[PDB]
């Protein structure tokens, strides 16, 4: 596990990436970590926004499965040949492993400008894999061939950083990456890491909303999404609650909002808290993000002002707990026990101040027995 500390490069704005050696002899690739999908796919051709691609003809241990797969996302898709090859994770495993891999020969809106990765690692469940749940996921391959528990945890250390590293621990929990207690919330469904949101608070204040709005379709934890995404109706409630507590295409991400450095904008904004049901259903815990996490700096130090992006965008189908929230917490994907754990990330600090908080237990007498429709 200690060999896996700081095995990630990147930042929330662009994503976090793992380094991988693929095939014989090895081809080094920079792989995005996506707990929101279930395929291992890499560039298979030259493309305008990647330095490098995996050449299956240059690998003696590559073996084509003789079919291709298409994966559609919300915005952006790709189509790739499916093969098997031997992979090594240098920062974590001395031994190499045989996984399925798709080699992208057609994509649209997938490799974007300024991106550092040239592949993605789907860490979600078998049920989401394409073309079917029968295509053994990368982590399922890893569990079996590496003898590790069915658990991985993730820490991003990008808070404060200009939008324009971390650790992925495969097979458990690294105690040097947190302090305090881990709070566990059950996984409601095994496809996405779907969990149950009870309440949203904006500065100690509950939104009027019914608890089901939060799980409208589903509430998921997804490292491959940048922002905290909310169902259109919930998003509108949060904007109006934040706005009437602070002082515009800002909210909708058409404009940035700028301040001179003396103006210290981080105090004018409220804290946002998401309540989650504990394994004991009679209690809940609270994950809190400060302004520093959702009022995001664009440029970084250099000028005598800063421009800021709003780290919360609307969504149609899901409530997506993305990097905007994941930057605050060490997140434990405890597949073996069907639960997701949260602890505060010691690295989530700016100017010595924690930019996230965790606390509980709180009673759930108030809320319905099941917020999941």
């Amino acid at each position, epitope marked *: 596990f200690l060999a896996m500390v700081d095995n990630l490069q990147g930042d929330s704005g662009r994503g976090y990436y793992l380094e991988m050696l693929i095939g014989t002899p090895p081809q080094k690739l920079q792989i995005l970590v996506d707990t929101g999908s279930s395929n291992f796919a890499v560039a298979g051709t030259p493309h305008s926004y990647i330095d490098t691609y995996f050449d299956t003809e240059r690998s003696s241990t590559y073996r084509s499965k003789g079919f291709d797969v298409t994966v559609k996302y919300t915005q952006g898709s790709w189509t790739g040949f499916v093969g098997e090859d031997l992979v090594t994770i240098p920062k974590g495993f001395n031994t190499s492993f045989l996984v399925n891999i798709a080699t992208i020969f057609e994509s649209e809106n997938f490799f974007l400008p300024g991106i550092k990765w040239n592949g993605i690692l789907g860490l979600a469940y*078998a049920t989401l894999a394409k073309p079917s749940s029968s295509l053994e996921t990368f982590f399922d391959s890893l569990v079996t061939q590496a*003898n590790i528990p069915n658990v991985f945890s993730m820490q991003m250390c990008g808070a404060g950083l200009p939008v324009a590293g971390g650790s992925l621990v495969l097979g458990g929990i690294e105690p040097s990456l947190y302090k305090g207690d881990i709070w566990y919330t059950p996984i409601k469904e095994e496809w996405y890491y779907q969990i149950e949101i009870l309440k949203l608070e904006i500065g100690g204040q509950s939104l009027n909303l019914d608890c089901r709005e939060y799980n409208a379709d589903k509430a998921i934890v997804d490292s491959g999404t940048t922002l905290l995404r909310l169902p259109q109706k919930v998003f509108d409630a949060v904007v109006e609650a934040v706005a009437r507590a602070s002082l515009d295409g800002f909210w909708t991400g058409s404009q940035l909002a700028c301040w001179t450095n003396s103006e210290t904008p981080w105090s004018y904004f409220p804290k946002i808290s998401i309540y989650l049901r504990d394994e004991n259903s009679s209690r809940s815990f609270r994950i809190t993000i400060l302004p520093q996490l959702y009022i995001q700096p664009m440029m970084g130090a250099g000028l005598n002002y800063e421009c800021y992006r709003f780290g919360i965008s609307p969504s149609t189908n899901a409530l997506v707990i993305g990097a905007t929230v994941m930057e605050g917490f060490y997140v434990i994907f405890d597949r073996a026990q069907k639960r997701v754990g949260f602890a505060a990330s010691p690295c989530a600090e700016i100017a010595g101040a924690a930019v996230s908080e965790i606390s509980g237990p709180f009673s759930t007498e108030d809320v319905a027995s099941n917020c999941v429709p």
Partner: nanobody
Amino acid sequence: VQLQESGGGLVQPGGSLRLSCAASGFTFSSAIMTWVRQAPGKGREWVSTIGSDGSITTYADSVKGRFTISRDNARNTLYLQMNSLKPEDTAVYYCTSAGRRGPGTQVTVS
């Protein structure tokens, strides 16, 4: 995805055994297949993996040389051939694919 292992039993040390995994409910011939064992009082141990076309085979050092993984794609069957068995091969052996496994077959080497 359904899987069924057989072939286990009580064998003497230095003996030999063939395990079988009959697979149904998915296209076996497209699937990476893996054998894992679970010895008593020990952690689960990976044994051997085989790529779908059966030309790539990998083995645990502890079985390198004695065990042979193989598959018959036409008959949706996976094999593990085990020679020079020793008391520490006593384990339940599980055939496994896409996070699914069968009920196992116990092997006892006294």
